[PDB]
Structure 1
């Protein structure tokens, strides 16, 4: 068995935020029916194709295990099919522009009358209360609005976006949490409900530690662990701190052998408070162990970049992998800056099911990120992503439509 065996999901989504959520639902055992505009489909099918004329990787990596129907929900037949789908489903997920699903006639209020058990999940750029409620959002728009761009990068550079999908997949994972909680809640109430997740809120959740810092800054006028302390200055808002420890212990990105020509010849190195003695032994600085300028985090902070420079005198001499193999013998929290090339080929990531090779029709093999959490009682089976409208007939037949009704829908461009 699987966690969501028997659950039916209507995936009325596109791009990344909504589809990441429903892909996980499929991997958990749900029947996910992706509802797509006839002849067009999810925009990711056509975006940044590496092979002409077939679905792009953007699509296949976000839509594994789903079924695809082509349905124009703006036609009379399409609206009726949508209603029948809603009546039979457990979950409906959508991430179209603000107002879009409403204008089709499928407001939450209507969805509720059709099926009081249905859970309706909606992703938008911003909350209902926001002055930006009607604003379209992509990944980095949310990173700017949610606090991440403000606090990422260097103090003497611009705000910087993260490569990680803070606005997209992150929001999808947050919606997923809400959908699973709503399924658990429905076990008690017998009713569905609406779950909304904004991209701004998803980014803010991950920036909780910077809201901690803002409050410390408001109270004290300084942030004792930030690069700016004590020889720099603070303004009224949490500043960018380069490669500082953030929510972790103090640390930095350090150069390893090759850094001049290899943009990934680096490690992250943590000075863990309770590990100062082992840290000193690792770098051959026994004299620093009890020296009062070095023996506490507070005393190190005003010359911490001298300390990092000293560690770097060692790390630039060996490959990042060697540097880590050595330093971890001293219980130092560190790791190489792994490139996507190293990740894509890493045997341990294949073994754990974190990077998964999947065979797609026409394309053949591709890699995707697998189900990130591991369960002792079940293993997701990750499959190909659907061809556009591959399952239209089957889905309509499951709803009880006859061959004549389906032929009429095709003639009327409802499918």
Structure 2
């Protein structure tokens, strides 16, 4: 009934994806997310379209549910005053500007910690708070290139490729969303806050893990394999009559299973393919033989023949197949929300499910400045007199829809 983060206020100055994705997941867990946006423009994702639904872009809608919106010009001293007043009654402070940018505006950790020594201050940057290239802005495609992910992603004999989605941004967001709750836990015993440094470079290098460990320990360089792997064969995507199927065999018994299903038992006892080490050594000839067979049948036929095989196998699905998959719908991944002016909209739902509470009901993504007046009056106790003055000056903006 009650979510674990209920009663936790998050002062959210994040933009784009990495930061907003972190605060969206905390909003799913019950946190009161107060999104601070530029009057007029707002979060950059608001203008990235088409596709557009009414006035809201699908980019913005996808990662900003379960948030409230206050449009405040934080470059204005009156806006800085509002941010500091909000931080004093908030538990978490999140931003993803270049290091020192918020500090130059009077909203750095030193400034905020002075008036909110309890606060958890989390900064999401491209390369960290300090260092030779720490002043560069963070970008997923740039980080995945510098961190080594792109070099190991792509066709074996082709150009490097990027993940279809900004996995480096999302991974960093997941690091931060966990780190913020670790800060809260630490705060619960000590009563004081701390500063958290998340960045795209650190997140992606850490995710290299064993691949990077192979070099740091064995001086082994990594390479691109397309859909295959360097140390285990066969294990890749195979072109079928109408699509692709991923199939793998991690040992001689799985390899026998695959060959029998493919009606190629003669390969099991062939001297070239009897062990995994030999299959890797003879991978080009083996994959060619297997690929010729895979392409003769439809994907649906191969999926039926592999039922109960006990080997890793799965079809390569497009968006149409993904959301026709009964398992996808079963997991609640099609989250529907009622937008006040745009109507019913559907986005990918929460990835984690808990037994003691439900997250299937989410507040729709806020309109720009939708909750400006509500926050100033209810959260900061501003009177109608002061709010009208800030509105008249343009320091804050209130959407027509409340």
* TM-score w.r.t. length of structure 2: 0.92
Partner of 1:268: 246
Partner of 1:44: 45
**1:120·1:193 contact (CA, 8 Å) conserved in 2?**
yes
1:118-157 matches, cutoff 5 A: 118-157=119-158
Partner of 2:287: 308
> Is 247-256 or 393-402 further displaced after alignment?
247-256
**Residue number among 383, 387, 390 corresponding to 2:363 in the alignment:** 383
1:361 aligns with 2:340: yes
Whole-Å separation in 1 of the counterparts to 2:365 and 2:111: 31
- Give the deviation of 1:248 after TM superposition: 7.9
**Residue number among 355, 375, 379 corresponding to 1:395 in the alignment:** 375
Partner of 1:406: 387
1:316-347 deviation line (CA, Å, top 9, x unaligned): 12222331232232212011111122223434
- Give the deviation of 1:80 after TM superposition: 1.4
Whole-Å separation in 2 of the counterparts to 1:160 and 1:115: 44
Partner of 1:233: none
Whole-Å separation in 1 of the counterparts to 2:183 and 2:234: 39
- Give the deviation of 1:310 after TM superposition: 2.5
**2:99·2:125 contact (CA, 8 Å) conserved in 1?**
yes
Whole-Å separation in 2 of the counterparts to 1:141 and 1:56: 24
1:244 aligns with 2:244: no
Change (3 A) 1:92 1:211: same
1:109 aligns with 2:89: no
1:235-294 deviation line (CA, Å, top 9, x unaligned): xx3222222236987511110112xxxxxx101111221522322322223344344432
Whole-Å separation in 1 of the counterparts to 2:374 and 2:233: 55
**2:234·2:283 contact (CA, 8 Å) conserved in 1?**
no
Partner of 1:341: 320
* TM-score w.r.t. length of structure 1: 0.89
- Give the deviation of 1:96 after TM superposition: 2.1
- Give the deviation of 1:217 after TM superposition: 5.0
Task: List gaps (5 residues or longer) in structure 1.
Answer: 222-236, 259-264
Whole-Å separation in 1 of the counterparts to 2:60 and 2:382: 29
Change (3 A) 1:103 1:247: farther
**2:154·2:160 contact (CA, 8 Å) conserved in 1?**
yes
Whole-Å separation in 1 of the counterparts to 2:122 and 2:351: 22
Task: List gaps (5 residues or longer) in structure 2.
Answer: 397-402
Partner of 1:80: 81
Partner of 2:36: 35
